[PDB]
Amino acid sequence: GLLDGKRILVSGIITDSSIAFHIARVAQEQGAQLVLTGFDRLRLIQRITDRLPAKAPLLELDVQNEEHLASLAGRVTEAIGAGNKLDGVVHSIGFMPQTGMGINPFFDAPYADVSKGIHISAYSYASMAKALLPIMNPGGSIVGMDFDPSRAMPAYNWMTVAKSALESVNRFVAREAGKYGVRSNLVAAGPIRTLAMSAIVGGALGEEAGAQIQLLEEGWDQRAPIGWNMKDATPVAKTVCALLSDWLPATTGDIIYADGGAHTQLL
Template sequence: MSGLLTGKRLLVTGVITDSSIAFHTARVAQEHGAQVILTGFGRMSLVNRIAQRLPEPAPVMELDVTDQDQLATLATRIREHADELDGVVHSIAFAPESCWGDFLAAPWPDVSTSLHVCAYSLNSLARAVLPLLTPSASIVGLDFDARVAWPDYDWMGVAKAALESVNRYLARELGPAESASTWSRQVH
């Protein structure tokens, strides 16, 4: 295959079904020539089956972005498939049921989980892959329009607004860096 992404190596996180944005991102990236590595969480047998539906079956690894051990080994596990990354797609979101539908009633532990998975994880993921990023690499986070308070979206909307803010701060911190080794020095 050849195209816009020929020779590029991408990590696409958050694949769970073939109707997910992450799956379609991986599919289109492959159609444009990229080598894709996928992550999923939880139902890994399902994620592995979904990966076989891509134009080229992609390697899959488990990634719980709240698990420090999994984040600490992520670069090593990715290196089994690619020496470097040209891009990372953060397509991860979760909020416990209590965070949907009754904004005032959601308990802090559930809100905290939502913020950790949806927003803080972009920072965690960026730090985990920094040693692998090429100088021109990009990290993309998928969000939702957080300019308004959507009915029933509640704490997920807050988490997505936080994700947008994390993105701005990562751009400020990592944007001026000239290389992955500079990023590693800045973050560690």
């Protein structure tokens, strides 16, 4: 197994279609002892997380909560037993109000909405890193989830911007985590049909967008030289796991692209 005896925090599970859930599963299948966090809906997360091939402690973590954040390292230490440190952390957290995505015009997103988006989507990356870097072993690795925001695109809107922040934050976090012998990197994933993502494809965030969501998806698989299955979250998790392994030991401040190579091709 590729993650034997590595202790790993994983945030961002909410359904079994979450990228994070699939990250968790693969992690465990490679021998990792996990520590999970979730947000708001503890009663639901707990029951979802029982499906993972292995029981793992779940802790509450709103990243907008200065307390949850302050207490964090303590409660992680309590969950894994003192004298022990984390080998890897998974940021797979993201949020944007519907005023900043879909058919709803770019200009009409009020800053209170966007800001919160960025707080959760981008800032929390450093917040998590700040809380956990104290309890991280040399060799350790933080990873977060990204969607390629170099070129603008329809619908994705302010969420594109948050991701633009996030890649740049990532780079500063690699400066700090560096000091503890810890890598930080992002995984730029092609689209994944989460429950969330399947709603948008039934009417949720509008009508003009829901066609542009499917158009995006289809064009992804067309540009990807090896192809892209939005219904399979595994190759993204496997990539994540390889950044949590000891096998990319010279890679920090960076973005790995698990996208079937689609960003590398124009048509």
